[PDB]
Write a protein that binds this ligand. Structure first.
Ligand code: CYC
Ligand code: PEB
Ligand code: PEB
Ligand code: PEB
Ligand code: CYC
Ligand code: CYC
Ligand code: PEB
Ligand code: PEB
Ligand code: CYC
Ligand code: CYC
Ligand code: CYC
Lengths: 22, 87, 98, 132, 160, 161, 172, 162, 115, 172, 160
């Protein structure tokens, strides 16, 4: 696929849940 | 157009904040000022790090040989007692 | 538009060569589809069966016609590769008509 | 009728101008000037102003006590669902059933979900026309 | 809604709505001008009802605000009051729909499974709703306080 | 796509009707507010790049979405995300001129919720970046024009959730 | 310029008739209101620099691009001219409250102000936001007792908000 | 702006005259001083961040109430402290504009006109900015005629505030 | 008073171009229109702006002609969103909490406490 | 009115920035040109009566209808007004040469002039012929040696010719 | 990666890797122990390369950190230096992969439209990459520095 690739598993940000105190 | 003016490559005339064309003389749109930097040489891609435009390895020639020369068969044929573009 | 998936210098000479009027719209489109930008975008991530349906979509504006066409382009992509595929589309008689 | 605005009459400069250098005269009016701006009439009794005698303090939330029909319908509807409510309320209290299974929500989460409406599962019935 | 709860009963037996059921729906919609006013008295007294009802809860249940309790700290007591506003908002939904349908579908179905997952004592949440019921029922007249007193009573029995 | 005028001609054409008093009311509503829309369409077109710069700064430039591992981390994923806000502002301006949300279903929302799910793009974050772009625009163009543009922002947000 | 007493005379003059007995009694209620009208104006002019500065400060918090470099209230001179506009509008709104008629407010303050801002490029939508902040700062200082006897000034602060709304609409 | 070149055009324009030799000598004197002026503007720019963070600290040392008093006018918050250093950077930026242009014309237009009305309205104190400009006058580190040109426009700002 | 027509503007603008600004204001102050109205001891004013019985006026002259007009409005006009790098805000959703946030009930636990 | 040095200051204040290090170095080349830019202004000011009169006389020889009765330059008052428009445009071109920026030229001279000659009936296509004749008389006089040291002034007479071309397309 | 880039060149022509392409992949893996030592020389010198490379940048481009520049402020200059750490990390990825593919797909594709959206001067980022190359190439020998020097050279041209 490539080098910088997105996956749900390696995503530790609060981007899919809007906890805006972090 | 902001990158071009931020690196000082050129000034791109745009719009005001409500959509009207910018202009220096209010007759026509997108008229821009001139002077002392539009005729300065060696600053083509200035502020762009390591820009190589043209023959960068040698200073340009003086070019100061301006003289008049009859344009046999290339002289523009003008009207007499008048001026072009209708009235 | 290419601003989000190119570095900035892949198809810069094709653009300058076209704005000078040196190449036609048919040469600019053949030279644009057989570049490293198209190979990276519509040939690497997909199989050849999906590369056929995308090639007719971009260069002919239609899906593949019938099975005799799928097995004709599939044999070109097996033997010659991508750039021989683009030439068979742009140099076809269907392209020159429409 | 009259010459254009500003041109002293009879002393125009385009009088005998040749065609090859004639300049078309732009149109000018008296609308940008201040004397030609329409005023309020105010001699016909029409002042375009606003002040006292034009204010209104409307009560938005309470018009007035609700109509006798809405108040009579309220007491009537309350008398119809009263016995239906007192029984459905007793069912909740006396339904102190026991528990079975493994807790799947902390300590709760046993075989049955709390307060799940039983009419949804048992209100949709499988029917066969020409029963068989 | 009372209209929805009547359509599912008639659909259960595969029939049209009875005259007794069409009689309720007529008497209900005609009273809409007074149901909208009862729900507005509570919607403009939210802070007095939640601030007063939660103030009484922490006198009758001093263990939820002690060390080790669920609502210990200022941020957990604020989440305590957030839930008392969730349930007051649902009571105004039930007053306007004429039925406990909006309450049971939002915040009563699986309510014990929710708080057991958070550690919250269900007997302490029902104690905070009982204290909000007196503040709410004290703002209303004789029989408007009887209609509002039911949705608080159904929520209590469902929460135990 | 159909605008407010074409929407009224098409609805009367499938019934066989001449334009009655009720169709003439909807046509008058658009012709009155038509001068208000050509004014906002020219002020949004001139501040297009700086509207999205300010709308991203208000919503998701100072979250941790750009942190390594999330979407819009790499340069390709950051550049592709402002290109969508670049899309939504330009298609909500086509819808405010036309007076009809018909162009958003045809050329924006067609298969978009499935495209974000396949790629992994947070849809709730896109809705709050659009809600910030609604606040930035409603102050630039005013209250009347800003309340019309906010009608087609909510249409993109409702069809995206 | 004409106040509320001179507008019922100017309208009765174009009919050519004396004022009626109910038109005198409606003006006797305005004399009776009187001192309560004088205490609306006394509270918005004794705090005139606090209405303007606190509402300007609340405007560049909400619209912070006006004081950015290149902005519409960016320089020392262009910021001081912005506080003149808030001080002029509050001056003529207060003139219309002591009169009871918004005649002086649109004869010599709102007369051509919408087309002044269009020739300059000033955003008239942001000037309307600034007037709306001076409005509720002025009606909040109008209905506080603080040195006035207790009573009902409810229809006087509704009229004061009407001149603030007239100025904010007439500017964009 | 008020430059040495626009004050030469304006002297000839005010009477409807061509540019005489009186005005060519004034523009010639701008070109002799511009060598020291454009090296001072280059050096104030090159050390601008070190001079602004130092001069804001010099204000808080002399007037420590500005970091403790509550209120909007004071730097007793993180938002008030960023707006203080924004103002020091406004005063330093106008100085390097006056060095480039060659006269007290940029800061007359952008900063000086209307400055009393702002400090009276927003409760700012001109003694805060004098102390900030006396730091930059003593800490820019220039010497010679380069320092003469830099201090001539810093002292122009101290004279308008005082 | 107001300009009579846009040829009075043309006729007087050549005084500024050939005599400068100092000769234009000497010629204006020495007209008989000036000396009959204000003389040398009266400050000028907008003469006959409003008719005696009317309620409206004639748009006072500081509002009719501001500093600059439609020409120069395409170079002297400011902008919104100027690419100017201002002070940042860094955490915008913590200033405006959403509906289920218990930070809206945070200055209520101060009140309903042990007292 | 702002020169070449104040033009880059006004462009940087709209971005709110300090001047870049290549912008200081490009302003140091203008200081180095300097003495030569002042030779061009000195050479077209010392001959300003002869730039105008020799190119006025050349204009009525090719266009004889301009001085025929009914023509635009026919009277004593209209002939003396053609000769002072040429002297005014030559005046603001030499102002723009010493400033390095066409901002004194198109704010004081060129703005509104096309619409003014149309209101008067003056043929703006013939004013442009008289400006282009003053251009050739100025650039032939800019590059003669005649008391100046020998060198390259080619990019300064390309800037002087650019101001004359700007004034000649702005009158029509 | 040199392996991946050589496979897409063959797959595009529908063939096997030629002996000249295979011969390049052979000496790529055999030199892996030496290339891993060059990447670790930079990995153990981040503090010197990013601090010195950033200090040299702010002296050649003082206006990006002066009041009014993009990187003005304590938190903004930190993000400025954060980006020089992003690009030093990618240069170690490329030394190990043998190709500029890790730098291109992370931080070069769409980089011009990205920085133009944040308002960042693209030429000020190229100046900071040239100043990191001066520190980094001084830590290496004659060879092993020409290798490191290329990945800094490509990032300059590709960024403009
Ligand atoms: C915070 C306010 C907003 C704002 C204001 C702003 N206004 C101006 C300029 C003018 N305002 C007027 C208005 C009046 N002048 C009057 O004499 C009266 C009473 C009779 C009114 C109502 C006029 C005539 C001008 C221009 C004339 C002049 O200044 O000489 C300016 C300055 C514009 C300039 O560039 O000079 C500002 C900044 N601007 C904002 O951004 C705020 C939203
Ligand atoms: C509404 C704006 C206020 C409020 C106002 C009341 N004021 C009342 C009486 C009153 N006010 C004044 C002062 C007034 N007269 C002046 O000459 C001047 C300035 C030169 C001012 C400000 C006086 C002298 C009086 C006494 C005379 C009188 O009572 O008419 C008043 C009447 C009290 C009553 O009900 O009897 C009211 C209501 N009161 C409010 O609560 C709001 C805030
Ligand atoms: C003739 C029986 C017509 C007619 C024509 C009128 N023309 C008027 C003015 C005018 N005519 C011309 C063109 C003229 N000038 C030239 O140089 C040449 C060719 C070499 C020609 C034909 C011009 C340019 C003008 C306007 C300039 C000026 O005023 O001299 C005219 C007077 C118009 C007016 O004053 O409004 C008339 C009446 N007259 C008629 O009645 C029939 C139609
Ligand atoms: C260019 C259009 C000319 C030309 C010009 C040159 N002048 C050079 C040097 C120079 N100029 C001046 C006079 C300065 N002071 C004034 O008062 C005026 C205006 C009246 C001016 C321009 C001086 C005093 C000097 C000498 C000082 C010095 O050079 O340091 C010059 C440089 C000399 C060279 O390159 O050899 C040039 C090129 N020369 C030409 O041939 C064209 C026609
Ligand atoms: C720092 C030395 C001290 C300090 C500063 C402070 N200033 C303000 C507010 C303003 N400062 C200005 C000044 C200018 N604006 C300009 O455009 C220019 C020319 C380019 C100048 C000199 C203005 C107009 C304001 C008010 C508008 C605004 O908020 O930006 C504040 C904020 C005060 C407030 O919000 O009311 C502060 C804190 N104060 C200190 O305590 C430091 C000692
Ligand atoms: C001469 C080459 C051409 C020509 C000229 C002509 N001009 C006029 C009259 C005016 N010219 C001006 C010009 C200016 N005013 C300014 O303020 C500026 C700087 C911005 C300029 C260049 C003005 C104001 C007038 C009218 C006032 C006056 O009496 O001069 C005339 C006279 C027109 C008339 O008398 O009606 C003439 C003849 N006409 C030509 O034929 C030449 C091509
Ligand atoms: C339409 C009209 C027209 C003309 C009249 C000629 C005029 C003319 N002659 C030359 C160019 C020349 N002209 C001559 C002519 C002479 N030198 C002498 O010694 C003799 C006295 C004399 C002829 C007997 C020479 C020798 C050159 C070349 C000079 C050189 O290249 O150095 C040039 C320059 C162009 C070039 O070099 O190619 C021009 C314009 N050309 C035209 O287009
Ligand atoms: C013989 C005994 C006898 C009565 C006592 C009345 C009783 C009565 N009142 C109302 C009905 C009404 N009566 C009033 C009147 C008023 N509300 C006020 O605040 C004012 C004091 C007053 C007006 C002057 C109003 C407003 C209603 C309508 C109430 C509603 O909204 O339902 C109606 C319905 C319609 C009608 O007839 O008006 C009846 C039957 N009629 C009778 O035949
Ligand atoms: C790169 C990945 C890829 C693959 C693998 C691929 C396969 C592929 N195999 C095909 C057909 C076919 N494939 C076979 C294969 C077989 N017959 C047998 O008995 C065997 C069990 C089996 C071989 C092991 C046959 C016989 C056809 C022709 C079917 C027909 O003519 O009807 C076709 C239809 C076109 C054609 O007929 O040439 C495609 C597209 N395409 C791709 O892009
Ligand atoms: C791994 C590849 C990769 C890169 C390169 C990358 C860049 C990147 N740079 C950013 C910001 C930034 N970058 C700078 C940089 C600079 N300011 C200047 O003046 C200098 C010229 C320049 C130094 C190089 C600044 C100031 C910001 C903050 C902009 C803002 O907050 O407004 C941001 C937004 C916030 C953040 O996450 O840091 C990203 C995503 N992301 C990536 O995934
Ligand atoms: C005109 C109607 C229209 C829309 C809306 C549209 C969306 C769209 N968004 C895309 C990607 C993307 N969109 C984002 C967006 C985001 N990342 C975030 O963190 C935020 C939540 C969000 C920005 C608000 C990202 C990161 C990608 C790249 C995915 C990838 O490269 O793997 C792509 C893939 C195309 C490509 O990269 O060439 C499409 C087609 N296309 C259309 O034609």
């Amino acid at each position: 696929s490539g080098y910088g690739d997105y996956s749900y598993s390696t995503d530790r940000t609060k981007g899919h849940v809007n906890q805006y105190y972090v | 157009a902001n990158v071009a003016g931020q690196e000082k490559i050129a000034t791109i005339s745009g719009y005001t904040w409500d959509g009207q064309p910018q202009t220096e003389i209010p007759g026509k749109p997108f008229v821009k000022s001139i002077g002392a930097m539009d005729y300065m040489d060696g600053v083509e891609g200035g502020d762009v790090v390591a820009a190589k435009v043209g023959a960068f390895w040698k200073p340009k020639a003086p070019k100061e040989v301006p003289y008049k020369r009859p344009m046999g068969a290339n002289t523009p044929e003008l009207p007499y007692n008048t001026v072009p573009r209708l009235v | 538009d290419i601003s989000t998936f190119v570095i900035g210098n892949e198809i810069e000479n094709i653009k300058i060569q076209f704005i000078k009027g040196q190449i036609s719209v048919k040469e600019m489109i053949n030279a644009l589809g057989k570049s490293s930008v198209y190979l990276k975008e519509f040939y690497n991530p997909y199989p050849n069966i999906k590369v056929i349906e995308l090639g007719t979509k971009h260069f002919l504006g239609r899906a593949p016609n019938n099975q005799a066409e799928i097995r004709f382009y599939n044999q070109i992509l097996a033997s010659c590769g991508l750039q021989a595929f683009i030439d068979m589309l742009t140099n076809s008689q269907e392209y020159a008509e429409i | 009728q009259l010459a254009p605005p500003g041109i002293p009459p009879g002393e125009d400069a385009r009088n005998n101008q040749s065609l090859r250098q004639y300049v078309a005269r732009p149109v000018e009016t008296y609308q940008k000037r201040s004397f030609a701006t329409p005023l309020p009439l105010t001699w016909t009794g029409e002042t375009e102003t606003v002040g006292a005698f034009d204010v209104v303090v409307p009560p938005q939330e309470k018009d007035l006590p609700v109509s006798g029909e809405a108040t009579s319908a309220f007491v009537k509807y309350s008398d119809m669902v009263r016995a239906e409510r007192k029984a459905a309320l007793q069912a909740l209290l006396s339904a102190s059933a026991a528990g079975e299974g493994r807790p799947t929500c902390g300590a709760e989460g046993r075989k049955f979900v709390s307060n799940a409406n039983p009419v949804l599962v048992n209100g949709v019935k499988c029917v066969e026309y020409w029963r068989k | 809604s009372i209209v929805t709860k009547s359509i599912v009963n008639a659909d259960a037996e595969a029939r049209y709505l009875s005259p007794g059921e069409l009689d309720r729906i007529k008497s209900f919609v005609l009273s809409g001008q007074r149901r909208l006013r009862i729900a507005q008295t509570l919607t403009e007294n939210r802070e007095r009802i939640v601030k007063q009802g939660g103030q009484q809860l922490f006198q009758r249940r001093p263990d939820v605000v002690s060390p080790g309790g669920n609502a210990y700290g200022e941020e957990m007591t604020a989440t305590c009051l957030r839930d008392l506003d969730y349930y007051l908002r649902l009571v105004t939904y039930g007053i306007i729909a004429g039925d406990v349908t909006p309450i049971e579908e939002i915040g009563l179905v699986g309510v014990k499974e929710m708080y057991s997952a958070l550690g919250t004592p269900i007997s302490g949440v029902a104690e905070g709703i009982r204290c909000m019921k007196d503040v709410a029922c004290s703002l209303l007249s004789g029989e408007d306080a009887a209609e509002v007193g039911f949705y608080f009573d159904y929520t209590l029995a469902a929460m135990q | 796509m159909q605008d407010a005028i074409t929407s009224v001609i098409n609805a009367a054409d499938v019934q066989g009707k001449y334009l009655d008093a009720n169709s003439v009311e909807k046509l008058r509503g658009y012709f009155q507010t038509g001068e208000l829309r050509v004014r906002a369409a020219a002020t949004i077109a001139a501040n297009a790049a700086t509207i999205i710069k300010e709308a991203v700064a208000k919503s998701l430039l100072y979250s941790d979405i750009t942190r390594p591992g999330g979407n819009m981390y790499t340069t390709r994923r950051y550049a592709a995300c402002i290109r969508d806000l670049d899309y939504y502002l330009r298609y909500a301006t086509y819808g405010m001129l036309a007076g009809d949300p018909s162009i958003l279903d045809e050329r924006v929302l067609n298969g978009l919720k499935e495209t974000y799910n396949s790629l992994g793009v947070p849809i709730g974050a896109t809705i709050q970046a659009i809600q910030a772009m609604k606040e930035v625009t409603g102050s630039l163009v005013g209250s009347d024009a800003g309340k019309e543009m906010g009608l087609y922002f909510d249409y993109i947000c409702s069809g995206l959730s | 310029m004409l106040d509320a007493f001179a507008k019922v005379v100017a309208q009765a003059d174009a009919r050519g008739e004396f004022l009626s007995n109910t038109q005198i009694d409606a003006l006797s209620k305005m004399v009776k209101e009187g001192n309560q009208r004088l205490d609306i104006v006394n509270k918005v002019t004794s705090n005139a620099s606090a209405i303007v500065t606190n509402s300007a400060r609340a405007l560049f918090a909400e619209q912070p691009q006006l004081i950015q470099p290149g902005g519409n209230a960016y320089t020392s001179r262009r910021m001081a001219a912005c506080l003149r506009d808030m001080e002029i509008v509050l001056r003529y709104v207060s003139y219309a409250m002591i009169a009871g008629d918004s005649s002086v407010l649109d004869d010599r303050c709102l007369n051509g102000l919408r087309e002044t801002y269009q020739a300059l490029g000033t955003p008239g939508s942001s000037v309307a936001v600034a007037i709306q902040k001076m409005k509720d700062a002025s009606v909040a200082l109008a209905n506080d007792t603080t040195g006035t006897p207790i009573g009902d000034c409810s229809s006087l602060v509704a009229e004061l908000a009407g001149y603030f709304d007239r100025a904010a609409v007439s500017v964009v | 702006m008020k430059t040495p070149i626009t004050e030469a055009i304006a002297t000839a324009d005010n009477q409807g005259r061509f540019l005489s030799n009186t005005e060519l000598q004034a523009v010639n004197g701008r070109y002799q001083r511009a060598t020291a002026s454009l090296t001072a503007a280059k050096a104030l720019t090159g050390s601008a961040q070190r001079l602004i963070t130092g001069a804001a600290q010099a204000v808080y040392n002399k007037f420590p109430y500005t970091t403790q008093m509550p209120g909007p006018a004071y730097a007793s918050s993180a938002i008030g402290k960023a707006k203080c250093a924004r103002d020091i950077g406004y005063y330093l930026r106008m100085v390097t504009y006056c060095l480039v242009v060659g006269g007290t014309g940029p800061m007359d237009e952008y900063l000086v006109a209307g400055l009393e009305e702002i400090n009276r309205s927003f409760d700012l104190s001109p003694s805060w900015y004098i102390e900030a400009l006396q730091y930059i006058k003593n800490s820019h580190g220039l010497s010679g005629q380069v320092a003469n040109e830099a201090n001539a426009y810093i002292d122009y700002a101290i004279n308008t505030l005082s | 008073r107001d300009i009579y027509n846009e040829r009075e503007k043309i006729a007087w603008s050549i005084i500024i171009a050939t005599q400068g600004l100092e000769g234009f204001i000497d010629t204006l102050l020495n007209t008989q229109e000036y000396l009959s109205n204000f003389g040398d001891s009266i400050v000028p004013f907008q003469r006959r702006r409003i008719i005696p019985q009317r309620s409206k006026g004639e748009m006072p002259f500081n509002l009719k002609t501001p500093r600059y007009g439609i020409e120069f409005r395409s170079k002297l006009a400011a902008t919104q969103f100027s690419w100017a790098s201002p002070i940042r805000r860094f955490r915008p959703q913590e200033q405006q909490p959403k509906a289920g946030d218990p930070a809206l009930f945070l200055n209520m636990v101060q009140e309903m406490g042990p007292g």
